[PDB]
Amino acid sequence: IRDDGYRLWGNRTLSSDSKWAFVTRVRTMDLVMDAILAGHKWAVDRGITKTYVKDVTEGLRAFMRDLKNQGAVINFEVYADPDLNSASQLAQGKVYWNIRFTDVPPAENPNFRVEVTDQWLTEVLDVA
Amino acid sequence: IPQTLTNTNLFIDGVSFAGDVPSLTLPKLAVKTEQYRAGGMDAPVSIDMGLEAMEAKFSTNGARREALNFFGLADQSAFNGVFRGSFKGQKGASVPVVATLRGLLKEVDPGDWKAGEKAEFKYAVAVSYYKLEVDGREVYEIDPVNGVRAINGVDQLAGMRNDLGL
């Protein structure tokens, strides 16, 4: 829109699912994880120690926290989903964590409500 | 039920010293305590703070070679050795008490050679690992570089091992 192809217009994206209505939502949810993986590269091998679970849940809380600091998200919550982490899964290498967080809602549709009254009329003009 | 110790024998590296070893000494297993006196109470109480420096010592009175040839050996805890000791008991059946102790030989003290007295060398292994068994049954197993103070099976540091994350 706007003069001679001034600018883009539309944060919305083709999605049947309303939750992923904003490209901001999708892009955040994707690139957040790009930053996580490019940083937890060390975590994808290595002999599982007693402190492996904690090394990772803290490493996550580092990258995640940094993103919060620079605006990227608004609060978050990382931990190591217990109802899944088991001896069997661990012997087979696997292990799970949760990373529930909130993304910056792009301000859209500011509703400037306006009323042209005659309240401040006497306050000026008449005599004064 | 009188037990008492009858005979004693000492190994270093399989080599039996069936001969020269008129004295053995197992490492005095002691805790560190620290007499805890504190608010709300008169009279201390004392706390498990870990063990003391286990040192064992034997003393062959012969120029034995097989013992002398471990002194100051670069590889601390290369000296192994097993301190066996048979407790008789008035009712015959003797109780084998045996104490393997991988440690560092540390020091060697040949006393006063007097031209008319058992010279008596001396030794004092700074014990690293130490497993004392009675009647073929583990009573102690103290391993510092690992934290494995285990009274007959049950490991009393199994709880601190976790909290340290080892």
Coordinates of N, CA and C in Angstrom, one line a residue, chain B residues 1-164:
Chain B
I1 N 33.0 -65.3 74.2 CA 33.5 -66.3 73.2 C 34.8 -65.8 72.7
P2 N 35.9 -66.0 73.6 CA 37.2 -65.5 73.3 C 37.7 -65.8 71.9
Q3 N 38.1 -64.7 71.2 CA 38.6 -64.8 69.8 C 40.1 -64.7 69.8
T4 N 40.6 -63.4 69.9 CA 42.0 -63.1 69.9 C 42.7 -63.5 68.6
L5 N 43.8 -62.8 68.4 CA 44.6 -63.1 67.2 C 45.8 -64.0 67.4
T6 N 46.0 -65.0 66.6 CA 47.0 -66.0 66.7 C 48.1 -65.8 65.8
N7 N 47.9 -65.9 64.5 CA 49.0 -65.8 63.6 C 48.7 -64.7 62.5
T8 N 49.7 -64.2 61.9 CA 49.6 -63.1 61.0 C 50.5 -63.3 59.8
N9 N 50.1 -62.9 58.6 CA 50.9 -62.9 57.4 C 50.6 -61.7 56.6
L10 N 51.6 -61.3 55.7 CA 51.6 -60.1 55.0 C 52.0 -60.2 53.6
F11 N 51.1 -59.8 52.7 CA 51.5 -59.8 51.2 C 51.7 -58.4 50.8
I12 N 52.5 -58.3 49.7 CA 52.8 -57.0 49.1 C 52.4 -57.0 47.6
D13 N 52.7 -58.0 46.9 CA 52.3 -58.1 45.5 C 52.2 -59.6 45.1
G14 N 51.5 -60.3 46.0 CA 51.5 -61.8 45.8 C 52.6 -62.5 46.6
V15 N 53.8 -61.9 46.5 CA 54.9 -62.4 47.3 C 54.6 -62.5 48.8
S16 N 54.5 -63.7 49.3 CA 54.2 -64.0 50.7 C 55.4 -63.6 51.5
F17 N 55.2 -62.9 52.6 CA 56.3 -62.6 53.6 C 56.3 -63.6 54.7
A18 N 55.7 -64.7 54.5 CA 55.8 -65.8 55.5 C 57.3 -65.9 55.9
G19 N 57.6 -65.2 57.0 CA 58.9 -65.0 57.4 C 59.0 -63.7 58.2
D20 N 59.5 -62.6 57.5 CA 59.8 -61.4 58.2 C 58.7 -60.4 58.2
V21 N 58.0 -60.4 59.3 CA 56.9 -59.4 59.6 C 56.4 -59.6 61.0
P22 N 57.2 -59.1 62.0 CA 56.8 -59.2 63.4 C 55.8 -58.2 63.8
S23 N 55.4 -57.3 62.9 CA 54.3 -56.4 63.3 C 53.6 -55.9 62.0
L24 N 52.3 -55.9 62.1 CA 51.4 -55.3 61.1 C 50.6 -54.3 61.9
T25 N 50.0 -53.4 61.1 CA 49.1 -52.4 61.7 C 48.1 -51.9 60.6
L26 N 46.9 -52.3 60.8 CA 45.8 -51.8 59.9 C 45.6 -50.3 60.1
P27 N 45.1 -49.6 59.1 CA 44.8 -48.2 59.3 C 43.7 -47.9 60.3
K28 N 44.1 -47.2 61.3 CA 43.1 -46.7 62.3 C 41.9 -45.9 61.6
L29 N 40.8 -46.6 61.3 CA 39.7 -45.9 60.7 C 39.0 -44.9 61.7
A30 N 39.3 -43.6 61.5 CA 38.7 -42.6 62.3 C 37.9 -41.6 61.5
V31 N 36.9 -41.1 62.1 CA 36.1 -40.0 61.5 C 36.7 -38.7 61.9
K32 N 36.2 -37.6 61.3 CA 36.8 -36.3 61.7 C 36.0 -35.5 62.8
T33 N 34.8 -35.9 63.0 CA 34.0 -35.3 64.2 C 33.7 -33.8 64.2
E34 N 34.7 -33.1 64.7 CA 34.4 -31.6 65.0 C 33.3 -31.4 66.0
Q35 N 33.7 -31.3 67.3 CA 32.7 -31.2 68.4 C 31.7 -30.1 68.2
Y36 N 30.6 -30.4 67.7 CA 29.6 -29.4 67.5 C 28.8 -28.9 68.7
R37 N 29.2 -27.7 69.2 CA 28.4 -27.1 70.2 C 27.7 -25.9 69.6
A38 N 26.5 -25.6 69.9 CA 25.7 -24.6 69.2 C 24.4 -24.2 69.9
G39 N 23.7 -23.3 69.3 CA 22.6 -22.7 70.0 C 21.5 -23.7 70.4
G40 N 21.0 -23.5 71.7 CA 19.9 -24.3 72.2 C 20.4 -25.4 73.0
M41 N 21.7 -25.6 73.1 CA 22.3 -26.7 73.8 C 23.6 -26.5 74.5
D42 N 23.8 -27.0 75.7 CA 25.1 -27.2 76.3 C 25.5 -28.6 75.9
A43 N 26.8 -28.8 76.0 CA 27.5 -30.1 75.6 C 27.4 -30.3 74.1
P44 N 28.6 -30.5 73.5 CA 28.7 -30.8 72.1 C 28.0 -32.0 71.6
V45 N 28.3 -32.5 70.4 CA 27.6 -33.7 69.9 C 28.4 -34.5 68.9
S46 N 29.1 -33.8 68.0 CA 30.1 -34.4 67.0 C 29.4 -34.9 65.7
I47 N 30.0 -34.6 64.6 CA 29.4 -34.8 63.3 C 30.3 -35.6 62.3
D48 N 29.7 -36.4 61.5 CA 30.5 -37.1 60.5 C 30.9 -36.1 59.5
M49 N 32.2 -35.8 59.5 CA 32.8 -34.8 58.6 C 33.7 -35.5 57.5
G50 N 33.7 -36.8 57.4 CA 34.6 -37.6 56.6 C 35.7 -38.2 57.4
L51 N 36.4 -39.1 56.8 CA 37.5 -39.8 57.6 C 38.8 -39.1 57.7
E52 N 39.7 -39.7 58.4 CA 41.0 -39.2 58.7 C 42.0 -39.9 57.7
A53 N 43.2 -39.4 57.6 CA 44.2 -40.0 56.7 C 44.6 -41.4 57.1
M54 N 44.0 -42.4 56.4 CA 44.3 -43.8 56.7 C 45.7 -44.1 56.4
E55 N 46.5 -44.4 57.4 CA 47.9 -44.9 57.2 C 48.1 -46.2 57.9
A56 N 48.6 -47.2 57.1 CA 48.9 -48.5 57.6 C 50.4 -48.7 57.7
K57 N 50.8 -49.7 58.4 CA 52.3 -49.9 58.6 C 52.6 -51.3 59.0
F58 N 53.6 -51.9 58.3 CA 54.2 -53.1 58.7 C 55.6 -52.9 59.0
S59 N 56.4 -53.9 59.3 CA 57.8 -53.7 59.7 C 58.7 -55.0 59.6
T60 N 58.9 -55.5 58.4 CA 59.8 -56.6 58.2 C 61.2 -56.3 58.8
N61 N 61.7 -57.3 59.5 CA 63.1 -57.1 60.0 C 64.1 -58.0 59.2
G62 N 63.9 -57.8 57.9 CA 64.9 -58.4 57.0 C 65.1 -57.4 55.8
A63 N 66.3 -57.4 55.2 CA 66.4 -56.6 54.0 C 65.7 -57.3 52.9
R64 N 64.4 -56.9 52.7 CA 63.5 -57.8 52.0 C 63.4 -57.6 50.5
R65 N 63.9 -56.4 50.0 CA 63.8 -56.1 48.6 C 62.4 -55.9 48.0
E66 N 61.6 -56.9 48.1 CA 60.2 -56.9 47.6 C 59.4 -55.8 48.3
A67 N 59.8 -55.3 49.5 CA 59.1 -54.2 50.2 C 59.8 -52.9 49.9
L68 N 61.1 -52.9 50.1 CA 61.9 -51.7 49.8 C 61.7 -51.1 48.4
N69 N 61.5 -52.0 47.5 CA 61.3 -51.6 46.1 C 60.0 -51.1 45.7
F70 N 59.3 -50.4 46.7 CA 58.1 -49.7 46.4 C 58.2 -48.2 46.9
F71 N 59.3 -47.9 47.5 CA 59.3 -46.6 48.2 C 59.4 -45.4 47.2
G72 N 58.5 -44.4 47.5 CA 58.5 -43.2 46.7 C 58.2 -43.5 45.2
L73 N 57.6 -44.7 44.9 CA 57.3 -45.0 43.6 C 56.4 -44.0 42.9
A74 N 56.9 -43.3 41.9 CA 56.2 -42.3 41.1 C 54.7 -42.5 41.1
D75 N 54.3 -43.8 40.8 CA 52.9 -44.1 40.8 C 52.3 -44.5 42.2
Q76 N 52.1 -43.4 42.9 CA 51.3 -43.5 44.2 C 50.1 -44.4 44.0
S77 N 49.9 -45.3 45.0 CA 48.9 -46.3 44.9 C 49.2 -47.5 44.0
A78 N 50.5 -47.7 43.8 CA 51.0 -48.9 43.0 C 51.2 -50.0 44.0
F79 N 51.8 -49.7 45.1 CA 51.9 -50.6 46.3 C 50.5 -51.1 46.6
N80 N 50.4 -52.4 46.6 CA 49.1 -53.0 46.9 C 49.1 -53.6 48.3
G81 N 49.4 -54.9 48.3 CA 49.6 -55.6 49.6 C 48.3 -55.9 50.3
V82 N 48.3 -57.0 51.1 CA 47.2 -57.6 51.8 C 47.6 -58.0 53.1
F83 N 46.9 -57.5 54.2 CA 47.3 -57.8 55.6 C 46.4 -58.9 56.1
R84 N 46.8 -60.1 56.0 CA 45.9 -61.2 56.5 C 46.3 -61.5 58.0
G85 N 45.3 -62.0 58.7 CA 45.5 -62.2 60.1 C 44.4 -63.2 60.6
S86 N 44.9 -64.4 61.1 CA 44.0 -65.4 61.6 C 43.6 -65.3 63.0
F87 N 42.4 -65.1 63.4 CA 41.9 -65.0 64.7 C 41.5 -66.4 65.2
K88 N 42.1 -66.9 66.3 CA 41.8 -68.3 66.6 C 40.4 -68.6 67.1
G89 N 40.1 -68.1 68.3 CA 38.8 -68.5 68.9 C 39.0 -69.8 69.7
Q90 N 38.5 -69.8 70.9 CA 38.6 -70.9 71.8 C 38.0 -72.2 71.2
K91 N 36.9 -72.0 70.4 CA 36.3 -73.2 69.8 C 36.9 -73.5 68.4
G92 N 38.2 -73.4 68.3 CA 38.9 -73.9 67.1 C 38.7 -73.1 65.8
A93 N 37.6 -73.2 65.1 CA 37.4 -72.5 63.8 C 37.9 -71.1 63.8
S94 N 39.0 -70.9 63.0 CA 39.6 -69.5 63.0 C 38.9 -68.6 62.0
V95 N 38.9 -67.3 62.4 CA 38.2 -66.3 61.5 C 39.2 -65.6 60.7
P96 N 39.2 -65.8 59.4 CA 40.2 -65.0 58.6 C 39.9 -63.6 58.5
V97 N 40.8 -62.7 59.0 CA 40.7 -61.3 58.8 C 41.7 -60.8 57.9
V98 N 41.3 -60.2 56.8 CA 42.2 -59.8 55.7 C 41.8 -58.4 55.2
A99 N 42.9 -57.6 55.0 CA 42.7 -56.2 54.7 C 43.6 -55.7 53.6
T100 N 43.1 -55.9 52.3 CA 43.8 -55.3 51.2 C 43.8 -53.8 51.2
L101 N 45.0 -53.2 50.8 CA 45.1 -51.8 50.9 C 46.0 -51.1 49.9
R102 N 45.5 -50.9 48.7 CA 46.2 -50.2 47.7 C 46.6 -48.8 48.1
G103 N 47.9 -48.6 48.3 CA 48.3 -47.2 48.8 C 49.7 -46.9 48.3
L104 N 50.2 -45.8 48.9 CA 51.6 -45.3 48.5 C 52.5 -45.6 49.6
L105 N 53.6 -46.2 49.4 CA 54.5 -46.7 50.4 C 55.0 -45.6 51.4
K106 N 55.2 -44.4 50.9 CA 55.4 -43.3 51.7 C 56.8 -43.2 52.4
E107 N 57.1 -44.0 53.4 CA 58.3 -43.9 54.1 C 58.8 -45.2 54.6
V108 N 60.2 -45.3 54.8 CA 60.9 -46.5 55.2 C 61.9 -46.1 56.3
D109 N 61.8 -46.8 57.5 CA 62.6 -46.4 58.6 C 63.4 -47.6 59.1
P110 N 64.7 -47.8 58.7 CA 65.6 -48.8 59.3 C 66.1 -48.2 60.6
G111 N 65.8 -48.8 61.7 CA 66.2 -48.3 63.0 C 67.7 -48.5 63.3
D112 N 68.0 -48.6 64.6 CA 69.4 -48.6 65.0 C 70.1 -50.0 64.8
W113 N 70.8 -50.1 63.7 CA 71.6 -51.3 63.5 C 72.7 -51.4 64.6
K114 N 72.6 -52.4 65.5 CA 73.4 -52.5 66.7 C 74.4 -53.7 66.8
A115 N 74.5 -54.5 65.8 CA 75.4 -55.6 65.8 C 75.1 -56.5 67.0
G116 N 73.8 -56.8 67.2 CA 73.3 -57.7 68.2 C 71.8 -57.4 68.6
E117 N 71.0 -57.2 67.6 CA 69.6 -56.9 67.7 C 68.9 -56.9 66.4
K118 N 67.7 -57.4 66.3 CA 66.9 -57.5 65.1 C 66.8 -56.0 64.5
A119 N 67.5 -55.8 63.4 CA 67.5 -54.4 62.8 C 66.2 -53.8 62.7
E120 N 65.2 -54.6 62.2 CA 63.8 -54.1 62.0 C 63.7 -52.9 61.2
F121 N 63.4 -53.1 59.9 CA 63.0 -52.0 59.0 C 61.6 -51.6 59.4
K122 N 61.1 -50.5 58.9 CA 59.8 -50.1 59.2 C 59.2 -49.5 57.9
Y123 N 57.8 -49.5 57.8 CA 57.2 -49.0 56.6 C 55.9 -48.3 57.0
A124 N 55.3 -47.4 56.2 CA 54.1 -46.7 56.6 C 53.3 -46.3 55.4
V125 N 52.6 -47.3 54.7 CA 51.8 -46.9 53.5 C 50.7 -46.0 53.7
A126 N 50.8 -44.8 53.1 CA 49.6 -43.9 53.1 C 48.5 -44.5 52.3
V127 N 47.6 -45.1 53.0 CA 46.6 -45.9 52.3 C 45.6 -45.1 51.5
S128 N 45.4 -45.4 50.2 CA 44.4 -44.8 49.4 C 43.1 -45.7 49.5
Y129 N 43.1 -46.9 48.9 CA 42.0 -47.8 49.0 C 42.2 -48.8 50.1
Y130 N 41.1 -49.3 50.6 CA 41.2 -50.2 51.8 C 39.9 -51.0 52.1
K131 N 40.0 -52.3 51.9 CA 38.9 -53.1 52.1 C 39.2 -54.2 53.2
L132 N 38.5 -54.1 54.3 CA 38.7 -55.0 55.4 C 37.6 -56.0 55.5
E133 N 38.0 -57.3 55.4 CA 37.0 -58.3 55.4 C 37.2 -59.2 56.6
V134 N 36.1 -59.8 57.1 CA 36.1 -60.7 58.2 C 35.3 -61.9 57.9
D135 N 35.9 -63.1 58.0 CA 35.3 -64.4 57.6 C 34.8 -64.3 56.2
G136 N 35.6 -63.7 55.3 CA 35.2 -63.6 53.9 C 34.0 -62.8 53.7
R137 N 33.8 -61.7 54.5 CA 32.7 -60.8 54.4 C 33.1 -59.4 54.6
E138 N 32.8 -58.6 53.6 CA 33.2 -57.2 53.6 C 32.6 -56.5 54.8
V139 N 33.5 -55.9 55.6 CA 33.1 -55.1 56.7 C 33.3 -53.6 56.4
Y140 N 34.5 -53.3 55.8 CA 34.7 -51.9 55.4 C 35.1 -52.0 53.9
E141 N 34.9 -50.8 53.3 CA 35.5 -50.5 52.0 C 35.5 -49.0 51.9
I142 N 36.7 -48.5 52.1 CA 36.9 -47.0 52.1 C 37.7 -46.7 50.9
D143 N 37.1 -45.9 50.0 CA 37.8 -45.4 48.8 C 37.6 -43.9 48.8
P144 N 38.6 -43.1 49.0 CA 38.5 -41.7 49.0 C 38.3 -41.1 47.6
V145 N 39.2 -41.4 46.7 CA 39.1 -40.8 45.3 C 38.0 -41.5 44.6
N146 N 36.8 -41.2 44.9 CA 35.6 -41.9 44.5 C 34.4 -41.8 45.5
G147 N 34.8 -41.7 46.8 CA 33.8 -41.5 47.8 C 32.9 -42.7 47.9
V148 N 33.5 -43.8 48.5 CA 32.8 -45.1 48.6 C 32.9 -45.7 49.9
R149 N 32.8 -44.9 51.0 CA 32.8 -45.4 52.4 C 31.6 -46.3 52.6
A150 N 31.8 -47.6 52.5 CA 30.7 -48.6 52.5 C 30.8 -49.6 53.6
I151 N 30.1 -49.4 54.6 CA 30.1 -50.4 55.7 C 29.3 -51.6 55.1
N152 N 29.9 -52.8 55.2 CA 29.4 -54.1 54.6 C 28.2 -53.9 53.6
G153 N 28.6 -53.4 52.4 CA 27.7 -53.3 51.3 C 27.1 -51.9 51.3
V154 N 26.2 -51.6 52.2 CA 25.6 -50.3 52.3 C 26.6 -49.1 52.2
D155 N 26.4 -48.2 51.3 CA 27.3 -47.1 51.0 C 26.8 -45.9 51.7
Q156 N 27.5 -45.4 52.7 CA 27.1 -44.3 53.5 C 27.3 -43.0 52.8
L157 N 28.0 -43.0 51.7 CA 28.1 -41.8 50.9 C 27.3 -41.8 49.6
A158 N 26.4 -42.8 49.5 CA 25.5 -42.8 48.4 C 24.6 -41.6 48.4
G159 N 24.4 -41.0 49.5 CA 23.5 -39.8 49.6 C 24.2 -38.5 49.3
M160 N 25.5 -38.4 49.6 CA 26.3 -37.3 49.3 C 26.8 -37.3 47.9
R161 N 26.9 -38.5 47.3 CA 27.4 -38.7 45.9 C 26.4 -38.0 45.0
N162 N 25.1 -38.1 45.2 CA 24.1 -37.5 44.4 C 24.1 -36.0 44.6
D163 N 24.1 -35.5 45.8 CA 24.1 -34.0 46.0 C 25.3 -33.3 45.4
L164 N 26.5 -34.0 45.3 CA 27.7 -33.5 44.7 C 27.6 -33.7 43.2

